[PDB]
Amino acid sequence: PKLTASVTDGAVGVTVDAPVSVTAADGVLAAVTMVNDNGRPVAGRLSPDGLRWSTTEQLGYNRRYTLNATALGLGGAATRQLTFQTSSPAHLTMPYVMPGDGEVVGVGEPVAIRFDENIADRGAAEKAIKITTNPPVEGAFYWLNNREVRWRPEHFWKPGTAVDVAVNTYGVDLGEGMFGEDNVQTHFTIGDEVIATADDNTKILTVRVNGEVVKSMPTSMGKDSTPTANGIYIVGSRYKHIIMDSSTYGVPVNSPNGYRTDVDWATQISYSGVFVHSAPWSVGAQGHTNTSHGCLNVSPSNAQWFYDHVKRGDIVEVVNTVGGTLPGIDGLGDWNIPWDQWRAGNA
């Protein structure tokens, strides 16, 4: 009878991203036990036909295990002992995915994987991220910085699409001895198409649901001094009220363009600090003149309507302002990068 392990006796550097197995050939598996360096049994299952056995729980880094298996066929008996050592990472990194599990989002919500460390080997990271879509659509990876990678289609998601994201980084060398701290797996669905548009020509924020106008909001955006970049913004988090602090976006409150205001019904559409919010002090200007540092000022009535009917992932498109274009790597500006450049990636 012949025995076969998925590991070699004195091996060093056993990844641990996959389980350990043993197969019997011209016979059956009569006994299999794996134990770690400090003596505890690892736990595993033996298939019903008794031909294959595999560990059933997560194996650990910096571990020294030893396998003892015996196969006994009609002919005779065979036994082997193997002791190996798993990967001992130099450092550990944890990934966080967005959006949340079971969430329903807008058609512009990209898949997000953020590591709490810089990733030396992006290919290894990407390769370890499995994305399923239904109906299937072509998508690609692209890094916003050294820690966050994002995945999205060429055009906005088609409503009803299911997105499944499995980040199987546990046991994977993500570069320079950087190993995944664990796995994570979110799943979400794409809802109604909600595209709001802010035209600096009319200074109105038009909200379109499935191509139909359902709201027109007078608005005052950033003033010439500090305009609102034109472009496609992806709706992020929504707040019933929030103290906006310019220092959060790099501008000292005490500075000229600095500020700190407690506003209501605020929906964030830019990491640079742009929000669609209630601005009762400028309702006068709303619809006629820009007076903000960049945010889309709207009446308190419209900001709340916006908070109740807009979801993360929906889109806000700004056009014709005196500002430039929202940066592709902003954090919610993903759609401003040409598909051509995005699909090619930067791994």
Side-chain angles (χ1 to χ4, degrees):
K2 331 291 289 177
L3 273 170
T4 299
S6 60
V7 168
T8 45
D9 191 355
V12 165
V14 183
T15 55
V16 101
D17 61 309
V20 172
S21 69
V22 178
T23 298
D26 299 287
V28 153
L29 243 34
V32 184
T33 61
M34 197 173 103
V35 169
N36 50 50
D37 35 284
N38 66 59
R40 320 207 175 183
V42 170
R45 185 131 302 187
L46 172 56
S47 69
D49 61 5
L51 291 188
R52 197 162 309 197
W53 175 93
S54 65
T55 59
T56 50
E57 66 178 314
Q58 175 176 283
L59 306 169
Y61 298 116
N62 253 301
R63 237 63 182 63
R64 198 192 67 110
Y65 296 109
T66 131
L67 256 180
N68 282 309
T70 80
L72 41 87
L74 211 184
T79 62
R80 292 287 182 293
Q81 179 177 288
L82 311 65
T83 176
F84 59 108
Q85 282 173 286
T86 59
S87 296
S88 59
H91 206 95
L92 249 43
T93 185
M94 181 62 107
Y96 300 77
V97 289
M98 273 304 283
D101 199 310
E103 239 201 295
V104 170
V105 294
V107 305
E109 181 80 334
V111 171
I113 314 283
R114 185 177 55 70
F115 293 102
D116 43 41
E117 301 293 349
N118 296 326
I119 298 306
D121 195 339
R122 298 186 181 177
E126 277 167 41
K127 208 173 188 309
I129 304 177
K130 165 56 181 173
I131 309 292
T132 303
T133 60
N134 185 36
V137 61
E138 186 202 4
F141 290 106
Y142 191 100
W143 299 65
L144 256 49
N145 56 54
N146 293 324
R147 307 190 169 189
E148 199 171 335
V149 67
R150 311 265 281 238
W151 195 97
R152 69 179 178 65
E154 147 150 41
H155 301 294
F156 297 150
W157 297 99
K158 176 183 170 60
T161 303
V163 194
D164 178 72
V165 180
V167 180
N168 308 145
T169 39
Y170 187 72
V172 182
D173 182 324
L174 299 174
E176 298 165 345
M178 182 86 262
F179 282 66
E181 183 174 289
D182 184 51
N183 298 305
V184 287
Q185 169 169 169
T186 176
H187 184 118
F188 63 103
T189 315
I190 305 302
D192 288 302
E193 186 189 66
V194 184
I195 311 299
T197 306
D199 192 321
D200 195 52
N201 288 342
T202 67
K203 302 219 191 313
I204 296 290
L205 176 58
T206 317
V207 178
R208 292 192 174 73
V209 176
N210 292 324
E212 180 183 7
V213 185
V214 304
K215 246 295 178 185
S216 275
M217 314 174 152
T219 179
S220 51
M221 306 177 297
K223 54 185 175 297
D224 304 50
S225 313
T226 63
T228 304
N230 292 289
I232 299 173
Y233 293 63
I234 307 170
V235 173
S237 297
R238 70 191 69 56
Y239 302 102
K240 294 182 291 177
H241 100 75
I242 188 168
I243 312 306
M244 291 192 290
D245 197 306
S246 65
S247 84
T248 300
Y249 317 120
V251 176
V253 187
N254 325 58
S255 303
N257 301 318
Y259 59 85
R260 185 165 51 212
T261 330
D262 185 7
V263 292
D264 297 298
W265 308 117
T267 302
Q268 178 174 37
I269 69 183
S270 122
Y271 272 29
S272 85
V274 181
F275 286 81
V276 165
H277 68 62
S278 173
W281 65 79
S282 57
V283 297
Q286 284 162 36
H288 295 74
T289 306
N290 298 335
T291 68
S292 88
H293 294 83
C295 290
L296 274 55
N297 277 23
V298 289
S299 85
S301 193
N302 287 313
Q304 174 190 51
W305 183 96
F306 205 81
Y307 167 108
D308 300 319
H309 298 65
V310 179
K311 63 184 61 171
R312 121 181 301 102
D314 285 333
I315 278 65
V316 160
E317 180 179 48
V318 185
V319 289
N320 302 319
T321 62
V322 303
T325 298
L326 187 63
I329 63 185
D330 160 87
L332 291 165
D334 305 54
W335 304 94
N336 297 287
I337 298 171
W339 178 232
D340 330 274
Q341 164 168 48
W342 187 287
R343 193 167 80 169
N346 46 2

